[PDB]
């Protein structure tokens, strides 16, 4: 009785939203950026190759100094590299070897990991004792953690395979806010530059815009055909790119609230594991299952270059804060820095 | 290089040595992935052989066995099943006393899960030890409730031997492309201490194949 009425009302509201966001599409991004000169051909070369991991790399995160980076592998290791000298700073042994994510704090005093243990571990990198020790274990999720991102030294946002994101308080150990609007497993997180809001991509082929302070969903974006595995804000904070198992990347605008462009090629059939943006936002770097990375022109959706050099699946990649280099990890147990 | 840079290089070398030692230690352990239903019987298997996922460590005849139970992960397993790409074996438990029971028959749910795991692209050449637990309840219950409830096309004698053989054949027939992996089937009860020997025998074959692969000739 009432369930059918509510379903009809939901369908009417969805149609209203679709009509509203179809009436503000007077042009496309391809049409506007058709008169700008394309970037010719990006020839990045492997400046550094970081060796030492003995299993699959599942995550990496650059530090804010653009020199130190953290990497997570199933060998039970969290390794911190000094990318200039290619020498290791710390090697943290995890209690659970099934790591799927890692984060580097903006201050540089903490690291985070998590995975199939359903716990986010925060390690203090700077102690009077010379070792790195577990400072906090955050245990409130009923599913595996797929991404963690520091807001500051005390707030961390996590996304889990229990169809839920969580904003925590590291000192008290309790999750301050719970974001629950998804249907499938949330696989990726991305923080906005202003820290006031973030975006989550899930296994229900949807992306959601979460307000951190309020705790509710602002907008939902639905243009993908399969699981969303990676997500990344544009440097402006008014757009974001998503990657999915359907071999497509996608640009969504927050203010227009719809798709802008699709980055896909008929020669690409494998899924996307990572997306990142250049410092200016002109390039879009996507890591693929077909063992290599692709550099697209974010304003024209054409393949500017190919970063080949990995023997297995590319799992994670990130661009430094100064835009100097890209770091790509893979299942072949190697990290590579490109410039 | 400066003095501090040289000391940093020395620290990195020590870290490399420790990582190599830990990798050598971890490459000699046998990894088992325990799969099954909650009432299928894995707690009995664990007890005989000894939130998140549960890790059980045991030792049997100069081997260290790490058993990973992922039953608490009530999520889309297509997003974390590749974490066990390199695993020595998969121990799949089925309680063959659930043919009558219903959660959709439990037995068909076990069959579907076995079909998904056996034919997964991450386990093309991974051995499967198939445990068929609760044989005593099956023998007691086969007299009253016939196997026709689970298999309408059975058409066989209602004895323990024939029904057990039919169950084993039905599970082994789900193995599409049954030339690139081996399936070991054992019938077990609660009061039975022979399962560690069965797992050891199954793992020995995998080790032989693995260190023939290391020695070039596959």
């Amino acid at each position: 009785s009432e369930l059918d009425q509510l379903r009809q009302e939901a369908e009417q509201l969805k149609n209203q939203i679709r009509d509203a966001r179809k009436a503000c599409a007077d042009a496309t991004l391809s049409q506007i950026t058709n008169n700008i000169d394309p970037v010719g051909r990006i020839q990045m070369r492997t400046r550094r190759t970081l060796r030492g991991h003995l299993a699959k790399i599942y995550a990496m995160h650059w530090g804010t100094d653009s020199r130190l980076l953290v990497s997570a592998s199933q060998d039970g290791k969290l390794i911190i590299w000094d990318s200039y000298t290619t020498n290791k700073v710390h090697a943290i042994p995890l209690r659970s070897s099934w790591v799927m994510t890692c984060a580097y704090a903006p201050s540089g005093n903490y690291v985070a990991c998590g995975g199939l243990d359903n716990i986010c571990s925060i390690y203090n990198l700077k102690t009077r004792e010379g070792n790195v020790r577990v400072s906090r274990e955050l245990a409130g999720h009923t599913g595996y953690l797929s991404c963690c991102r520091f807001l500051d030294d005390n707030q961390i946002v996590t996304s889990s395979g229990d169809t839920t994101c969580a904003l925590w308080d590291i000192e008290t150990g309790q999750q301050t806010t719970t974001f629950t609007g998804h249907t499938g497993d949330v696989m990726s997180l991305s923080l906005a530059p202003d820290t006031r809001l973030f975006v989550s991509g899930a296994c229900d082929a949807s992306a959601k815009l979460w307000d951190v302070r309020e705790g509710m969903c602002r907008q939902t974006f639905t243009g993908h055909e399969s699981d969303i595995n990676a997500i990344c804000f544009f440097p402006n904070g008014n757009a974001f790119a998503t990657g999915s198992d359907d071999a497509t990347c996608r640009l969504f605008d927050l203010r227009a609230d719809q798709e802008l462009m699709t980055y896909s090629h008929d020669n690409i059939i494998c899924g996307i594991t990572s997306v990142s943006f250049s410092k200016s936002g002109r390039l879009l770097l996507a890591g693929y299952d077909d063992f290599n990375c692709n550099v697209w022109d974010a304003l024209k959706a054409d393949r500017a270059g190919v970063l080949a050099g990995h023997d297995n699946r590319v799992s994670c990649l990130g661009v430094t804060d100064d835009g100097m280099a890209v770091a790509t990890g893979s299942w072949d147990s190697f990290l590579k820095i490109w410039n | 290089l400066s003095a501090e840079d040289k000391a940093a290089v020395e620290r990195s070398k020590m870290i490399d040595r420790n990582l190599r030692e830990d990798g050598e230690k971890a490459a000699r352990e046998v990894k088992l992935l325990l799969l099954g239903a909650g009432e299928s019987g894995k707690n009995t298997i664990v007890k005989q052989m000894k939130t998140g996922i549960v890790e059980t460590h045991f030792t049997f005849k100069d081997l260290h066995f790490k058993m990973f139970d992922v039953g608490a992960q009530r999520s889309e397993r297509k997003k974390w099943i590749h974490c066990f790409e390199g695993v020595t074996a998969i121990i799949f438990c089925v309680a063959l006393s659930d043919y009558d029971l219903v959660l959709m028959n439990r037995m068909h749910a076990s069959m579907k899960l076995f079909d998904s795991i056996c034919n997964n692209k991450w386990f093309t050449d991974t051995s499967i030890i198939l445990f068929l637990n609760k044989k005593d309840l099956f023998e007691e219950k086969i007299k009253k409730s016939p196997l026709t409830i689970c298999y309408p096309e059975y058409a066989g004698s209602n004895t323990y031997e024939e029904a057990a053989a039919y169950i084993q054949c039905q599970f082994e027939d789900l193995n599409k492309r049954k030339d690139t992996k081996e399936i070991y089937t054992h019938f077990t009860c609660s009061t039975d201490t022979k399962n560690v020997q069965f797992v050891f025998d199954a793992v020995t074959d995998v080790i032989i194949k693995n260190n023939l692969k290391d020695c070039g000739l596959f």
Partner: single-chain antibody
Amino acid sequence: VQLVESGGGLVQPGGSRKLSCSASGFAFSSFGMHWVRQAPEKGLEWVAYISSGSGTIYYADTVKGRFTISRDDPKNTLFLQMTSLRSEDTAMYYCVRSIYYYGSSPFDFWGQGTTLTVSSSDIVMTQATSSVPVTPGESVSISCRSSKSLLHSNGNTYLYWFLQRPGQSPQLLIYRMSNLASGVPDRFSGSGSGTAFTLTISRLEAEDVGVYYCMQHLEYPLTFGAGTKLEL
């Protein structure tokens, strides 16, 4: 976190003695260790260095081949074995903890040292100032000069400013010029270029009255500079 010294005392000339230092409170195996001595009324002087893993050992030319360094990681004990003790070996011996990675703070913890009395191509670091009269609340600058550029090609300047209060072991203030050590008030700052360096105290209480020392870590044998005393 502490490093407690042991040994020392009065030695007839030409003898041998084993100074010890027990660590308690930190991961001793991952910390390089130094022995640094101070004459009864003179300034500091670096004696020896042994790295984590016992793979690198450096001695000062004044005791090279005469002193020996060693470490027992399970026992957390650092040893200095001294043979043929000359009368120029009478001093206070300090065990210094230092760790070296990117962004480290070498020379950040010191023991209390052991007194030792014996009975009857090196960079020169210059501190021309000495016994500067200071009033509380003022701003003070301490100058330092080097006989070589301390700026390496990596972009680092290996100047260390330590503070030794009257009756206390020296404490790190700055480890690479303008880098402020942990637990030090923000009223301290450092500036410099090449062979010239200044350490500035903006407004000072009675706690930071003592002797300030410059130290070069560009290359061994880690020469010090005669300290500049602040007098109230």
